[PDB]
């Protein structure tokens, strides 16, 4: 799973960069650059994940048990996808809030953003772990 895991790693590190919320991040968060970069990084992760699933499916050598396992794998993939989408939507909402605030970003707003980002990062981690374990049992 090295490839999909490596893409996931890149996503995660860019997310930590955003988590710092330094002045560079703050200015990029109002110009869509960050959100689009995250979208690129998550598309790669999902493509690679599907590729790895397909190649593992060739290596496989009952039917109901296999069907159940494939269903579980699909469910885990979807969860990871949803989590990254959530992160990106929370970042678009922050842009909108700062705009509705007439371009003003309060410290309170940013504290809330950080809190929510940490909560979305934990979910992502758990789901990623589960997906890895499912790929292992597959």
């Amino acid at each position: 799973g090295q490839r999909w895991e490596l893409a996931l790693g890149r996503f995660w590190d860019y997310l930590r960069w955003v988590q710092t919320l330094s002045e560079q991040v703050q200015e990029e968060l109002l110009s869509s650059q960050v959100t689009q970069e995250l979208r690129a990084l998550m598309d790669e992760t999902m493509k690679e994940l599907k590729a790895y699933k397909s190649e593992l499916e060739e290596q496989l050598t009952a039917e109901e048990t296999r069907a159940r396992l494939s269903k579980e794998l699909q469910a885990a993939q979807a969860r990871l996808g949803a989590d990254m989408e959530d992160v990106r939507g929370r970042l678009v909402q922050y842009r909108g809030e700062v705009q509705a605030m007439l371009g003003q970003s309060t410290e309170e707003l940013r504290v809330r953003l950080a809190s929510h980002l940490r909560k979305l990062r934990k979910r992502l981690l758990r789901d990623a772990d589960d997906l890895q374990k499912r790929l292992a049992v597959y």
Partner: protein, 390 residues
């Protein structure tokens, strides 16, 4: 086909946890038996043209979509339109705020942000007084995490009051909502003549003083609102008439603290006037004693001078105060605020008073503040008594 039955619930669709609710179904005049089904539950709820189904206590088990249909001597009717009975007394309450301020220009647009601490919630904005469909984020759904929801409210016409309340719900149970959020009233400011906001307790306030901001108008408004920029709500007092035409209202803010230091604008309206007047001139309330860092006031040439010389009061500090203010004991005008300038190890501000006259004499004190909160000042400097001589 017979006329399809109709379905309605009194007092309403949204019923609190425990509150009683009765659903009614109307069919044909010769109807034989009415059957109320529930999406998900085959069992009919409870039981000639009017048939009721009463629920003693609304519980999470009665919260769902219901459909009605009556039996006729010729067969069964079409199922009814669904009715979503909602139980809205469960989850903790969320927080509704306004962006950028509760006061909006008439005909203008704004955004109301609803939010909760936990995730996985779908928010609904309910405008009090309007019989509209619950406004869910799902129309503009976004993958964010369920923590917040931004609802754009607009054009804010001043023909009625705009009061809002917010609820949230988990996707698994779409008809079980949370506790209603605290309501938010939106004020439509217009172009009518502005009132006047006058403090009655001096320019710089020290902790413990009873601040009373008096708002007044000559146009004859009947109700006044005071808003501190940055807050979620406002204070409202009616406008008494000491004189015919003159309408005034004293907003007793009481003892002062960190919270009382800010910019206040007053708006005036009438009992029948939903819209509000243009804002009054801001009244920046400065709070002394909120910074333990110290400032010092010196006079150059000296505390003693003769009329016609050049006196320059210097307010200095080793701390990097962004601005330095100057007050004269007895003067009611706001303090002279000047920016700091790094000199010989001490940041300073020179308050030039040349040529000096008989009026320049008096007790002077200087303060210092930061741009983080320009209303929280330091403790006063030791007084300086400038003495001019003819």
């Amino acid at each position: 086909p017979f006329p399809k039955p109709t379905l309605w619930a009194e007092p309403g669709s949204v019923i609190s946890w425990g509150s009683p609710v009765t659903i009614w179904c109307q069919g044909s005049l010769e109807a034989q038996e009415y059957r109320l089904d529930k999406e998900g539950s085959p069992e009919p709820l409870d039981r000639k043209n009017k048939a009721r189904f009463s629920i003693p206590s609304m519980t999470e088990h009665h919260a769902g979509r219901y459909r009605c249909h009556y039996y006729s001597s010729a067969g069964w009717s079409e199922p009814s339109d669904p009715l979503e009975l909602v139980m809205t007394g469960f989850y903790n309450k969320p927080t509704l705020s306004a962006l950028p301020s509760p006061v909006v220009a008439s005909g203008g647009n704004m955004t109301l942000r609803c939010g909760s601490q936990k995730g996985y919630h779908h928010f609904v904005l309910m405008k009090e007084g309007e019989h509209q469909l619950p406004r869910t984020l799902d129309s503009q759904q976004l993958h964010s995490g369920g923590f917040q929801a931004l609802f754009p409210v607009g054009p804010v016409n001043p023909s009625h009051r705009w009061r809002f309340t917010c609820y949230y719900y988990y996707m698994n149970t779409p008809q079980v909502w949370s506790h209603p959020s605290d309501p938010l009233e939106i004020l439509p400011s217009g172009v009518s003549r502005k009132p006047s906001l006058l403090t009655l307790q001096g320019p710089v306030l020290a902790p413990g003083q009873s601040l009373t901001l008096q708002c007044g108008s000559d146009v004859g408004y009947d109700r006044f609102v005071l808003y501190k920029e940055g807050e979620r709500d406002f204070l409202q007092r009616p406008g008494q008439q000491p004189q015919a035409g003159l309408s005034q209202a004293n907003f007793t803010l009481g003892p002062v603290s960190r919270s009382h230091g800010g910019q206040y604008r007053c708006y005036g309206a009438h009992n029948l006037s939903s819209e509000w007047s243009a804002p009054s001139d801001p009244l920046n309330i400065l709070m002394a004693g909120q910074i333990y860092d110290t400032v010092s006031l010196s006079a150059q040439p000296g505390p003693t001078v003769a009329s016609g010389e050049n006196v320059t009061l210097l307010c200095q500090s080793w701390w990097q105060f962004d601005t330095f203010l100057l007050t004269k004991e007895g003067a009611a005008h706001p303090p002279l605020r000047l920016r700091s300038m790094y000199g010989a190890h001490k940041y300073q501000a020179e308050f030039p008073m040349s040529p000096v006259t008989s009026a320049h004499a008096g007790t002077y004190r200087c303060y210092g503040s930061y741009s983080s909160n320009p209303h929280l000042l330091s403790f006063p400097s030791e007084p300086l008594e400038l003495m001019v001589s003819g």
